[PDB]
Amino acid sequence: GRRGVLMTLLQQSAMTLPLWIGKPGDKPPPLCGAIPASGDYVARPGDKVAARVKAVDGDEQWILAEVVSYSHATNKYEVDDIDEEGKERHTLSRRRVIPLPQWKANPETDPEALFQKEQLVLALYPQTTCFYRALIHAPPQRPQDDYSVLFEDTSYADGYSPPLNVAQRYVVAC
Template structure:
C-alpha cells in the first residue's frame, strides 16, 4: 500500500510540475499580447481617427489575452487542487513511517509550515467562499476526516482547555470523535469527544481582496492558537489580514497583563476559528 501511494505521489508531483510550466507559458503569452495592446492603444491616442483595421486587430488581441488568462487561471486552479491531493498523500504516507518523538521546536516549525502552505481558495468572481474557507463555519452535518487537524475541548488537570489535536476516527454509533493531542511531549494523549467539543480548522485560506466575507472583522472575538503553543485561547481581532500574505493581529485574553490582554500577536488564518456561542456565555 505504501509503495502504491508513493508512486501516486510521484505521479501527482509530475502533473503539478507540468501544470505550472503550462501556466507560466500562458502568462508569458498573455504578457506579450497585453504589451501589443498597450502599444496600439498608445498609437491610437495620437491619431485623430481609428482605422477599422486597427479596431479589428485590437479586438483579436483582446480575445487572445482573455483566452490566455482563462487558460492560465484553469491551470492554477488545477494546480491548487493537486497541491491539496499531494498534501493528503504525504499525510497518509507518514503513518507508514516508524513512530518518532517530535521535539517542541520541530513541532512548532511543522505547524508554521502547515499554516503557510494552506491552500488558497480561488472561486468564481462574485461567488461567496465555501464552508471551512477562512472564517466560514462548517455545515452542521460536516464530519471531520481521519488525520484532520482540529481544536478539541479536553479536560486536563481539572480544567477545560482547547488544544490542537488530530482526528483518529469518528464513531457513528455514538457520535463521538477519537482524537490525539498533536503535542508529542504529552505522549500523544487520546480523547473521546462529542461533536460539540470539536472545531475543524479551515481547509482553505481566504483571499481578503476577493472573499472579504470569509475574513473575521476587526473587533470580533475568535478562538486562536497562541503562538509557540498547541493551545487555543479567546482573542480579539486587532487587525484582519488585507492580503493573502498577511496574518491576523490578535489581542489574546491574558490575566497576567494589567489590562487583561496581551500585546497584539500575529496568527495565521489556519489557526483562527469561530468562537462558539456557548463560549460567549
C-alpha cells in the same frame, strides 16, 4: 528538540493551507477562513481541529489536534494531539471539536470570509499548541498575512495582550 519540531510542524501546516480561488459568481465554501462548517458536519481522518480536552487533573484546554476517526454509533470523535508528548488519543463529543479552516480566505477577493475587527475568536497562542480567547485586532491585508489579535490576558492592566500574529489556520469562532 521537541519544541523546534513542534513549531516547525505548526508553520508547515499554516503555510500549506490552500488559498480559496473562486471565479465570478462563486462564494467561499464552508471552512474557508471564517465561514463555519455546515450543520452536522463531521471532520474526516487527518483533518486538523481545535479539541476541548480535560487533563487528568481537570484542567480544560482547547488543543491543536488531528481527527483519527468518528463513530456514528456514539457520535464521538477520536483525535490525536499534534504533539508526540501527548500520548492519549481522546474520545470527544462533537461540541468539543471545532474544525480548523481548510482554505485561507483571500482578503483581496473574499473579505467577507475573514473575521471582522473586534470579533471574539479562539486563536492559537504563539509558541503553544493551544487556543485561547482573543479579539481580532486586524485582518490579514494580503493572502500571506496573519491576523493580528488581542488575547484576553489578565497579566495586563487593561485585560489584553499586545497585538500578536496568528495564521488563518489557527483562528476559529468562539
